[PDB]
Design a protein around this ligand. Structure first.
Ligand SMILES: Cc1cc(CO)c2cccc(NC(=O)C3CCNCC3)c2n1
Lengths: 39, 156
């Protein structure tokens, strides 16, 4: 049996750690909601 | 139960100790998460009970107490923020410029940030603080690193 606990407000924060890249990927989505890499 | 707007952890005790299985957003009295987190199961907020209202396994989304409320969209240009809520750790904004999922049915925003599976449901924001979708349905690329869709539902 699952329960929920508050964790924070939803706010844009200035000078958050900036990171990750921006990859453009060819993907397929099956009927089970699973993404896959087309190649 | 607590119905204050904001972000929440999704916990279970059915396992060893208390385990964070995911995350969600409360807005306009509706709770928003990903289907693979709850599998459409009822939830508890203190003593209050939340019942599923809408859900789609293929979108991998589910709403509780009412219809899907979040309708903001990535503009296709700007940096965004993942409000990561990882298991056992405090909420944390990470700023990123999303990449792209190209599919036969159109293009989706994607964020290249690897966090634990229990972070599934953490919201992605624009600079106005509006939620443009949820983190945690994605793919493992050649390297071995994880990339998530920006998953957004329809508001009716
Ligand atoms: C293997 C892996 C690794 C990581 C982080 O390293 C994940 C992080 C969040 C969510 C995950 N799961 C999904 O995206 C599934 C895909 C199939 N549809 C249901 C959700 C992850 N899966």
């Amino acid at each position: 049996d699952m329960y929920i606990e508050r964790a924070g407000d939803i706010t844009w924060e200035k000078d958050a750690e900036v990171t990750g890249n921006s990859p453009r990927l060819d993907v397929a989505l099956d009927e089970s909601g699973d993404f896959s890499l087309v190649e | 139960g607590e119905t204050t707007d904001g972000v929440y952890r999704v916990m279970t005790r059915r396992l060893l100790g208390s385990t964070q299985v995911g995350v969600g957003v409360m807005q306009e009295g509706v709770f928003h998460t990903m289907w693979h987190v709850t599998k459409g199961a009822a939830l508890r907020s203190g003593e209050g009970r939340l019942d599923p209202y809408w859900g789609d396994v293929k979108q991998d989304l589910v709403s509780y107490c009412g219809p899907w409320k979040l309708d903001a969209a990535w503009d296709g240009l700007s940096e965004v923020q993942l409000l990561a809520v990882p298991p056992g750790e405090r909420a944390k904004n990470i700023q990123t410029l999303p990449g792209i999922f190209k599919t036969k049915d159109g293009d989706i925003g994607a964020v290249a940030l690897d966090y634990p599976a229990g972070t599934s449901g953490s919201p992605i924001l624009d600079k106005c603080g509006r939620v443009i979708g949820l983190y945690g349905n994605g793919v493992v690329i050649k390297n071995g690193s994880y990339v998530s869709a920006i998953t957004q539902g329809k508001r009716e």
